[PDB]
Design an enzyme around this catalytic site. Sequence first.
Site: not given
Ligand code: A1BNN
Ligand code: K
Ligand code: ZN
Length: 353
Positions: A133, A171
């Site tokens: 990311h 992923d």
């Molecule tokens: O899901 C995420 C981040 C997960 C990222 C996977 C990294 Se491999 N953040 C979020 C923000 C607002 C509301 C709900 C979730």
């Molecule tokens: K992916």
């Molecule tokens: Zn992820």
Amino acid sequence: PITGLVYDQRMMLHHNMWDSHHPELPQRISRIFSRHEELRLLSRCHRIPARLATEEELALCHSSKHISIIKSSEHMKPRDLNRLGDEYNSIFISNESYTCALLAAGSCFNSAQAILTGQVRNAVAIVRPPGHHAEKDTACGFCFFNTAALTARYAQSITRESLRVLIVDWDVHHGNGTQHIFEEDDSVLYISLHRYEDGAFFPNSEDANYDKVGLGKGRGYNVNIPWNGGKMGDPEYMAAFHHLVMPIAREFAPELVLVSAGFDAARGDPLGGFQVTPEGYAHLTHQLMSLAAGRVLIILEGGYNLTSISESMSMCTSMLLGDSPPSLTPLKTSATVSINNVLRAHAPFWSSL
Ligand SMILES: O=C(CCCCC[SeH])Nc1ccccc1
Ligand SMILES: [K+]
Ligand SMILES: [Zn+2]
Ligand SMILES: [K+]
């Protein structure tokens, strides 16, 4: 044939001091490592040493500004660490974060170097925090530097500019940073399967849709496989590999395969909602091993169920070690739609489709 493995307990130092139960846990890598021990997979591998990436290696993909702000957090007060972390989308920062992100990148550099000089044929990298990311100028989604993107560039720096590198990102989240770093690049092929939901799923951008095929020289060299409408599993991922990922990778003829191997599409994962089984990740690994004379590096990304990710990455390592793949159904309608949408969008660039 030798399989390499890199892991350093020091990467556990990255921690969330305001929420000890944040899912990007230090115990993600130590649980995976222990299971590799319990399965006698660690003793079957050649242990590759970890190291810190250098700033000059970080600049291969990242701007000076982004490096120096993540660098400055190494000496920050907790109030400043909280404020700085809140400036990004889904980031927490501690005083050790920068160091660990350097170790995660350097561990993969060392691994790619072991593969490319013939010391090992393939390798598995149990590293944190993730990086897919991370943009050239921003940290995002628990990621600080884009470890997979840096390893592709590092690999070319120690071989040649035109080294063909395939980055497969299974992923559950779209690797927005990896796509953006190589969007205008025909030397690195980016292929991502990811839950999309019309942009309702993190990282919440239509950059992840199937119609994003690249820019300039890189058109055709970005393949997005976005899922809509709920839980996906082994049949959907196997069919996507059969009709898309593996036909395109063979026509691309990668010399080196990097796997942005998040395991947050596995069953039990709260940030994925999918049911890809450990046996399925074994088959995805096995198919990728048919490319690039077996030159595969599996880079841990996401994956937040400690048991599912330890079981899953163990299965992948076992495939690298050459074990017989394990025994492993109609796709959901939206998966058929997603696959045929990618197929129609990439037909102009990949004649074997
Ligand atoms: O899901 C995420 C981040 C997960 C990222 C996977 C990294 Se491999 N953040 C979020 C923000 C607002 C509301 C709900 C979730
Ligand atoms: K992916
Ligand atoms: Zn992820
Ligand atoms: K590309």
